[PDB]
Amino acid sequence: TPMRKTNPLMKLINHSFIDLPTPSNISAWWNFGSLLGACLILQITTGLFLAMHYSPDASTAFSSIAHITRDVNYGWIIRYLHANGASMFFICLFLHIGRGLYYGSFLYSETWNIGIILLLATMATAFMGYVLPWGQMSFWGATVITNLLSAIPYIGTDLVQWIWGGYSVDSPTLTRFFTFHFILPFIIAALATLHLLFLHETGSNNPLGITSHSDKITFHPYYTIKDALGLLLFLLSLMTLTLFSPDLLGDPDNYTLANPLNTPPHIKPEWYFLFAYTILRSVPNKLGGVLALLLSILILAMIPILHMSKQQSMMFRPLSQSLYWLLAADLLILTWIGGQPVSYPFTIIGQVASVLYFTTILILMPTISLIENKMLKW
Amino acid sequence: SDLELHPPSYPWSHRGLLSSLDHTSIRRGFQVYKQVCASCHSMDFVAYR
Amino acid sequence: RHRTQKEIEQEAAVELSQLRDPQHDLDRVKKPEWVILIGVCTHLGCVPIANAGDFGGYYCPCHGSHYDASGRIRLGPAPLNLEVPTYEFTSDDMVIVG
Amino acid sequence: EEEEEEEELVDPLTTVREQCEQLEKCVKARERLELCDERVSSRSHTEEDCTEELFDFLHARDHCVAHKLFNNLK
Amino acid sequence: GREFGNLTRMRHVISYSLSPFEQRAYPHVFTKGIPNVLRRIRESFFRVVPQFVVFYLIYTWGTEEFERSKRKNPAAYENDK
Amino acid sequence: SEAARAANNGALPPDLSYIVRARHGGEDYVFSLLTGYCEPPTGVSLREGLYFNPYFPGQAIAMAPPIYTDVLEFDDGTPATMSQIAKDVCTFLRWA
């Protein structure tokens, strides 16, 4: 009788960590989920120190940022590990969703839906956080994206003013976003605990998609060091990205102090929201781009219903794989289009990329799932 | 109207991945800043430290 | 800017298709003799000069911009027309704005 | 004062900026530019602007200049 | 619940395993390791790459066409005469 | 700022504390901005207060050409070419 199995606290550490069975054949992709947790742990503490110096007012915020970057000891390292740590969080997150789209992990539908809720909370979090610097890009990013709420027919403007706390973006709004952006991640942690809670009672999926009870393995000796290798590679990419070229992934012309009087020439959202932005800018009429913006993230819930293949894993279904990487290329298309100024060549490709983005996940996939069902005589 | 000309890249000393800024140039450049620049340009965030 | 009827004439007279940022004159202001506008230029935030310019309307020294009496941009770098604030007349001597 | 020493300084930016102009890309861009200029002069109310061709010239110009300037400066 | 003591039944499937210290951490790396990675790449390659190649053509076209859309300012004045 | 506009025909000279990392192309935008002052193109005209610097996005910067040879004499005793001047300026701003 090991001490871990008698202690009520240790039983949770024993089941959730040290002794839960895992498929033997798990690959690199399953590391990313754990990385997300670590990223959160990094996004909190690092960001927490920024909270010790940042002052959420319309005037003092930017100067407080200069105070962090300069007068504060090692402050710039914190600000860059934080700001780039968020982008790393979205890299790991997009890949983490992508493996779920690939290996058919979405059949764990409740965990899937909770994951979607974590996705939306993460988007509100990063968005409200990007407003904090109160640079040129921030004021107008928040201005436009909050002007999107103008679209709703009856609530429209009254709702927007209720978010602004006034007739325009200003100090009270910046304080609003400071509080909400300060509070959401801690909700994200609890929902993540729910996420693992709906995950562990069924067991982790394996890349083959076949049930793997015959070859389960204790999590500790192997996956603690495998995940540790993942943490080390993650710190590799993050520390290189911050200590060598911190601003390549950042946006220049954000550093200029916000001018309500003046609109920056290009004005774009930071890249991880940005693909969705196309679905806005491509669609005609102010409201339809909003509904398309909602459907763009909310389809994911619709996806498990659309499953038609008698299998699970994508690896045994190459025709689906072609559509899958086609869809990923379509996402890159949406990002590059969203990185660009309005013009016919861009708008056309945006129309096509959007409509293709929906047709691939609604129409095309189930049908070839059926065709693959018939190729193998089911 | 038409978008502005895109500036050529230059073989700067500090653009090396490991190479550092040359402080003598920073000194001489500050000595340029004190006269020609300072008459009509603020630097809000830099102290005499 | 309360204004002379002749400016209402020259503003109404202008061809609409030619405008850099087209917008019908009478369709803008609620009453043509009055023109209420944000005082900031739409280009780079400089404030246009009142009672000046080729049209006798507005002019921006910062980069030579030319606004008409109705405040629509024409000559110069500036893209879209001067913004029109929401407002309403109440008592005839008074005008609420915003 | 003495004009010479001013004459002496010359500057290295200008000298480099001429040798690159001597090269054929800057030459064809230059003659095409002057062609655009003369075409602009040809009529009383031209809408054409040669600034575009001026960019076509200056881009390859200063790009060629970029390889050689800090080689001269210390 | 689904602890190791109670999962799927299975019947006489014998297995063999050496101690970590009894064997090299990098067995036959060149003779078998690299060719394996190469076979794997050769399997994934045609499945994965072409869509990305398709993406590139579009990316190149879009920028280039946009260049025709804007940088060919002289075509419009040329149309003026 | 309003006085600064009054002293500069309404133009406001930007703070140089982050002028490098703000502009696209960074400090590369700056040196070329100083080094370059081509005479105005035929067929285009602009206000006398405006000055034609092609690298400026408005292509008509309000700033007068700030530097020329021997505007200033370095204590280091190094020659005061406008190129060396603009180079030292961009280096110092980059550090700034």
Ligand code: HEC
């Ligand atoms: C008062 C004369 C004056 C001096 C001398 C001067 N500046 Fe400027 N500068 C201005 C003004 C005014 C502007 C605003 C340009 C505009 O509004 O179009 C400006 C613009 C700039 C810009 C570019 C802003 C942009 O939007 O691209 C930089 C960089 C700059 N100043 C820094 C400098 C540097 C470096 C020097 C070299 C000593 C210098 N200033 C000297 C007045 C001056």
Ligand code: HEM
């Ligand atoms: C803060 C955000 C998230 C955290 C901390 C998190 C954490 C985890 C962890 C640790 C796992 C264990 C398996 C693994 O690590 O790969 C997992 C599994 C899973 N997650 Fe997430 N996740 C997050 C976001 C998401 C999102 C956005 C989705 C879906 C859109 C999602 C859906 C899933 C699914 C379907 C599994 C099952 C994988 C399997 O069974 O092997 N999660 N999650």
Ligand code: HEM
């Ligand atoms: C998943 C969780 C989080 C993400 C993705 C995130 C993301 C971001 C982003 C993108 C910025 C903008 C920084 C910039 O552009 O320079 C930011 C700023 C900031 N964040 Fe977070 N954040 C998270 C959680 C937190 C937490 C938990 C705290 C505090 C406990 C926090 C405090 C701050 C502060 C004070 C700033 C202003 C500093 C600055 O703007 O440089 N954040 N965050």
Ligand code: FES
């Ligand atoms: S500032 Fe109004 S035109 Fe440049």
